[PDB]
Every structure is written in C-alpha cells, then in structure tokens.
Amino acid sequence: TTRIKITELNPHLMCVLCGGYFIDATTIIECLHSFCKTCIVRYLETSKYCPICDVQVHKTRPLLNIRSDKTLQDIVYKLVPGLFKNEMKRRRDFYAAHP
Amino acid sequence: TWELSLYELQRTPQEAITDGLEIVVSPRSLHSELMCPICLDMLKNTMTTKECLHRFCADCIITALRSGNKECPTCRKKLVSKRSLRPDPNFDALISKIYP
Ligand SMILES: CCc1c(-c2cccc3[nH]ccc23)[nH]c(C(=O)O)c1-c1ccccc1Cl
Ligand SMILES: [Zn+2]
Ligand SMILES: [Zn+2]
Ligand SMILES: [Zn+2]
Ligand SMILES: [Zn+2]
C-alpha cells in the first residue's frame, strides 16, 4: 500500500478536451485514446481523426469505432474522491430543474 | 446511436484537483479492475479487445484463445480476426505508477 499525490495521476485521468476528469469515459478502439463521452462525440462531429495521436477513426462513420470504457471510468471514480457523488448530484439537480 | 441527453448536451467540465491531496491504495483496492482474470496477478504487457475494450496480459491471452473458445473471456463474445487485439501503452503507462 502506498499514498500517491493525485497531481501524479491527473494526466492518466483527464480528458484533453474538457481539461477535467473523465465523465462517461469513451475510447477510440484503434489507438486506445480516451475522452469524455460528450467531448469526443462533439469532436467527431467535425473530424474523422483522433484529437491527440491524429489517426483516422474511420473513412466515413467515426462513431463506429469508439466504445464506452467502463473499466477506465471506474478507475477514475475510485481514485478521485467524491467525483461520483459530485457528478451524480449534478445530474439529479439538472432533472430537478428540467422535467 | 450516441445521442446526447439534455444533461449531456449542456454538461460542464468536472474540475480536476491541483490541491495535492494524496490517495491511499492497497494491492487489494481497485483489484477488480487491475487483475487479468487469467492469472489473477497484476496486468503485465496489457492487451485490449477492440470490440469490447477488455484488458488482459499479452502473454496470458494467447493461451485462453488457444484452448478453443475464440470468444472474449469476460463478456463471452466472438473474437473476430487478429487485428482485434492491440497492446495498450496508455494503460501500462498507468500501472507503472502503482507498483503495489
Ligand atoms: C493476443 C492474441 C493476438 C491476436 C489475436 C486476436 C484475436 C484472436 C486471436 N486468436 C489468436 C490470436 C488472436 N492477434 C494478435 C496480434 O497482435 O497479432 C495477437 C497477439 C497480440 C500480442 C502478442 C501475441 C499475439 Cl498472437
Ligand atoms: Zn472531457
Ligand atoms: Zn489516438
Ligand atoms: Zn495475465
Ligand atoms: Zn469482451
């Protein structure tokens, strides 16, 4: 057992579009790069290539070659204290204002 | 389809932590996510299935497909081709931070 400064993990746990932690983590199944579900869907609305490594996700339908990464998202929710509380509370608050 | 719900449409970043808090992590903690279900030790030379994003050992996965089932040992789905297996450097990058 060790104690780790989280500033050491934040690279492995953060979306390069959102500047923050992964929420609903999603993965390009070609290069194994990962982004928030919403971040990459909006990105792929205008590019068929990875934001980081710059590979072609598909010639035509980029969304074809990306999958949810629950394995990765669970690692985030576990390492980052109360991130899951915070994110779930955010969603309830929203639907309490928009039914 | 990847349709974004009203929430997802307007969601904001989840701000990261620059504060420098420290988390405590045992070899048991997070073990459900870090153990190759073949060898039940730490993932060494990780591999991932492209159809389902499941991680295994490079040295370990060759023998489970070798015993005749040609499906994903986790979600029991037919593993097509050989290009369905890619080594995962961004994932081993993560193991190297957590020796125990
Ligand atoms: C891990 C297995 C595998 C596959 C593959 C993919 C899908 C079904 C398969 N059934 C046998 C193998 C294999 N393809 C490859 C490959 O990269 O060529 C591998 C592989 C990866 C790393 C090291 C050694 C090998 Cl052989
Ligand atoms: Zn993001
Ligand atoms: Zn990439
Ligand atoms: Zn293994
Ligand atoms: Zn699988």
Curated annotation (Swiss-Prot), chain A:
<comment type="subunit">
    <text>Component of a PRC1-like complex. Identified in a PRC1-like HPRC-H complex with CBX2, CBX4, CBX8, PHC1, PHC2, PHC3 RING1 and RNF2. Interacts with RNF2/RING2. Interacts with RING1. Part of a complex that contains RNF2, UB2D3 and BMI1, where RNF2 and BMI1 form a tight heterodimer, and UB2D3 interacts only with RNF2. The complex composed of RNF2, UB2D3 and BMI1 binds nucleosomes, and has activity only with nucleosomal histone H2A. Interacts with CBX7 and CBX8. Interacts with SPOP. Part of a complex consisting of BMI1, CUL3 and SPOP. Interacts with E4F1. Interacts with PHC2.</text>
</comment>
<protein>
    <recommendedName>
        <fullName>Polycomb complex protein BMI-1</fullName>
    </recommendedName>
</protein>
<comment type="function">
    <text>Component of a Polycomb group (PcG) multiprotein PRC1-like complex, a complex class required to maintain the transcriptionally repressive state of many genes, including Hox genes, throughout development. PcG PRC1 complex acts via chromatin remodeling and modification of histones; it mediates monoubiquitination of histone H2A 'Lys-119', rendering chromatin heritably changed in its expressibility. The complex composed of RNF2, UB2D3 and BMI1 binds nucleosomes, and has activity only with nucleosomal histone H2A.</text>
</comment>
<feature type="short sequence motif" description="Nuclear localization signal">
    <location>
        <begin position="78"/>
        <end position="92"/>
    </location>
</feature>
<feature type="zinc finger region" description="RING-type">
    <location>
        <begin position="15"/>
        <end position="54"/>
    </location>
</feature>
Swiss-Prot record, chain B:
<feature type="cross-link" description="Glycyl lysine isopeptide (Lys-Gly) (interchain with G-Cter in ubiquitin)">
    <location>
        <position position="97"/>
    </location>
</feature>
<feature type="region of interest" description="Interaction with nucleosomes via an acidic patch on histone H2A and histone H2B">
    <location>
        <begin position="78"/>
        <end position="83"/>
    </location>
</feature>
<feature type="modified residue" description="Phosphoserine">
    <location>
        <position position="26"/>
    </location>
</feature>
<comment type="function">
    <text>E3 ubiquitin-protein ligase that mediates monoubiquitination of 'Lys-119' of histone H2A (H2AK119Ub), thereby playing a central role in histone code and gene regulation. H2AK119Ub gives a specific tag for epigenetic transcriptional repression and participates in X chromosome inactivation of female mammals. May be involved in the initiation of both imprinted and random X inactivation.</text>
</comment>
<feature type="zinc finger region" description="RING-type">
    <location>
        <begin position="36"/>
        <end position="76"/>
    </location>
</feature>
<comment type="subunit">
    <text>Component of chromatin-associated Polycomb (PcG) complexes. Component of a number of PRC1-like complexes; these complexes contain either the polycomb group ring finger protein PCGF1, or PCGF2, or PCGF3, or PCGF4, or PCGF5, or PCGF6. Part of a complex that contains RNF2, UB2D3 and BMI1; within that complex RNF2 and BMI1 form a tight heterodimer, where UB2D3 interacts only with RNF2. The complex composed of RNF2, UB2D3 and BMI1 binds nucleosomes, and has activity only with nucleosomal histone H2A. Part of a complex that contains PCGF5, RNF2 and UBE2D3.</text>
</comment>
<protein>
    <recommendedName>
        <fullName>E3 ubiquitin-protein ligase RING2</fullName>
    </recommendedName>
</protein>
